[PDB]
A and B are shown apart, each in its own frame.
Chain A
């Protein structure tokens, strides 16, 4: 009950998506005899743990993190390789601040996400696919 309300629904699945992932990410490398149902958890987890990278002395606020983690649960970054995903994060948080600075303002003031603000991120997912 100490976690932000805008973080229990985007990271509540992230906590248990890395639970059945520690053992499937270590043995998936030696052979390509994996199933599409077992290797898919690695295709998303290899970016989620890569998303959790953070530069030194670079604290990101709460209003800039909720967008990213919501896309990781839905798996909208599985296509981008493990090389540009860190750059994907670099120019995705800068675009939404120039596109929807109002959404970044409400979450930083309310911290509450209804059913209307969740559909707002859907339109933000359709613009970086061509970049």
Chain B
């Protein structure tokens, strides 16, 4: 990604917001892979240390190695909007030129946290 955060050393606990619904991959999980949707992502170290990230797309390749892989475009902490309110209204109102650009930019703001 534009940033690189996680090594592949130790098994950890992570949740994923998939297109088949928000799931959870722990330990020797089945190589279940499908595209993720722009939403919140919860990551927790051992003993319950609270962390968080964000995802704007990509898959989550899993192999019987007890280690999860995740790729996206955005990967920052949650701590890191009047212009978006106009960009949201400007997306709601689109003419005959392909609207598709309008709807997609609002599905990433559905998290809003």
A contacting B, Cβ–Cβ less than 8 Å: no
Chain B residues near A (Cβ < 8 Å): none
